[PDB]
Amino acid sequence: DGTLDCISMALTCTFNRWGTLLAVGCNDGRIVIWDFLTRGIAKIISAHIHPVCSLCWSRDGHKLVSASTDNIVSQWDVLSGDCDQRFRFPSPILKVQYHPRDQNKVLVCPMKSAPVMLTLSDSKHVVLPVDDDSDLNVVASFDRRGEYIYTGNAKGKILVLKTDSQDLVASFRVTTGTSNTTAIKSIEFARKGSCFLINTADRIIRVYDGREILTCGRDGEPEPMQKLQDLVNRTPWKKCCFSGDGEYIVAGSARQHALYIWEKSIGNLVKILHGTRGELLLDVAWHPVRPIIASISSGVVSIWAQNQVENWSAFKELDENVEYEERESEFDI
């Protein structure tokens, strides 16, 4: 539905705060900041020699946190492209995430170690707690306002901490239905409201409302707002994301390189988008204020927009025949 030839080795992308720019990582380890309106590249940053697998914009948009595969995280000013700060860790980093309401702070999910929240002003770090002490794979994310931290382990356990004190404000383990746990693949939140989603190893996305987890307390049984899956193919989900408003949810079937689109309230599947059967789906993102969806597959990015009835359909356009309502004086002088 529209691709870009000007970028190669697309690996990970991230919309800015207003959905005007897109920073995509490349295998060479370069940042390609490409613009939507001019439909061209806005910037090229020599980030790492190692490909970049995690990228996040700052709220003001002037900072981008990038993670190399060399366990090298670095902050870059979008105007200049300089490495503002640079750090390295053990257990290679799985993800970075700016704090949405404090760009000085940034959480980092490493591979084998617990996620740690650092600051840029001071090169300090706060190691977030781990429930089972043996997960070795815990994804973590700020909420919409950056007030709480949601951490999900490979054993389905879900901890909600407060971002400042790291104190356990809520907890619950998700189930595979019967009695078993499932590897929490990812935690996503809505940029609007409080609904969030969890991708798990059961190939079943679970949509909740964080207020219900907060009122559920520690070690409770919160039910999901929704349960979403491909009941037909039972396909895993490499990457999923909400819509900009938060009423549409998309999942990327890397198994068959497709895109499933459900709703939030009803949860019925909006639609499906099919990509090149030969392409391996890698990354998925939604335009924050547009029905536009960016996909990264086999190093190539594709764009999926959604237009209205007009752009040619605007006499007064009607859809179905209209019986004329004759009047009393319809034949009168």
Partner: protein
């Protein structure tokens, strides 16, 4: 009511002037003409700054950049040309219009250009690469005037076929089509400063202010004479709220904005007052007339 008096008379274009525009900082006055020449002049003293040539045919429109650093020139050579106002360098020459380009305007963020041509198609252009990003079979007649809204989300277009069409910028979607029960050749169109209204001139001695959210004409302005040429209209805001325009009777008409009543008639031009420009900051109005006058006159009032 205004009391605009002639302060400076400007001239030098060897041919018929087609457009005069005040720089957004109010520092310069750009005057385009069919002589393939543009003339930058001092906006407060009538001091001729320089002449910028390079266009191959007559120039039908010119538009300033928001930072008062660039000028787009739409010429009859089917080309646009983006110039640095400080150096006069042809930074870009926009090719792709299949016929005479008549109007041109920058986006509110000055990074994009809209262009109307005789080809009856509106082209949407990059600035930093000068690349045509969109092209729309907008009208069934040569385009007269194109303009941006307050932010750059909407593009209004007028043409000789009498249609005033509002189009989406991000998609080229023909949002609205304003009709006034007839087919009056619309020679000029532009958004309101608040982006809420639209001023369109029709070639029947009539100006019309429409509501965008309502899609209906709110006010009408007559008394002038305009039936053949692209006579520009501007909003006088630095003093009282007025509507200033040229007329085929060598007059410079100024109506009240709300009451639609003529508040001044600036006479002194000998030919049709072909182009008008209102100062962005001061109560200064540049009125340029056609070849039988070849003069541009600065008018300053006290309100």
């Amino acid at each position: 009511k205004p009391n605009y008096a002639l302060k400076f008379t400007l001239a030098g274009h060897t041919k018929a002037v087609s457009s005069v525009k005040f720089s957004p900082n109010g520092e310069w006055l750009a005057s385009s003409s069919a002589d393939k020449l543009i003339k930058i002049w001092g906006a407060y003293d009538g001091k001729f700054e320089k002449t910028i040539s390079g266009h191959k045919l007559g120039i039908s429109d010119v538009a300033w950049s928001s930072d008062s650093n660039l000028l787009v020139s739409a010429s009859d050579d089917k080309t646009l040309k983006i110039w640095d106002v400080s150096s006069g360098k042809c930074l870009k020459t926009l090719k792709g219009h299949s016929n005479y380009v008549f109007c041109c305007n920058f986006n509110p963020q000055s990074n994009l250009i809209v262009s109307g041509s005789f080809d009856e198609s509106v082209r949407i252009w990059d600035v930093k690469t000068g690349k045509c990003l969109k092209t729309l079979p907008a009208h069934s007649d040569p385009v007269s005037a194109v303009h941006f809204n307050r932010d750059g989300s909407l593009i209004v277009s007028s043409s000789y076929d009498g249609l005033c069409r509002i189009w989406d910028t991000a998609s080229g979607q023909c949002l609205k089509t304003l009709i006034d029960d007839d087919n009056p050749p619309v020679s000029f169109v532009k958004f309101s400063p608040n982006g809420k209204y639209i001023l369109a001139a029709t070639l029947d001695n009539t100006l019309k202010l429409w509501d965008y959210s309502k899609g209906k004409c709110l006010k009408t302005y007559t008394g002038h004479k305009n039936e053949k040429y692209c006579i520009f209209a501007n909003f006088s805001v630095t003093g009282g709220k007025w509507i200033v325009s040229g007329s085929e009777d060598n007059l410079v008409y100024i109506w009240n904005l709300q009451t639609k009543e003529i508040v001044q008639k600036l006479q002194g031009h000998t030919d049709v007052v072909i182009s008008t420009a209102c100062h962005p900051t001061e109560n200064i109005i540049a009125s340029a007339a056609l070849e039988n006058d070849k003069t541009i006159k600065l008018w300053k009032s006290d309100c």
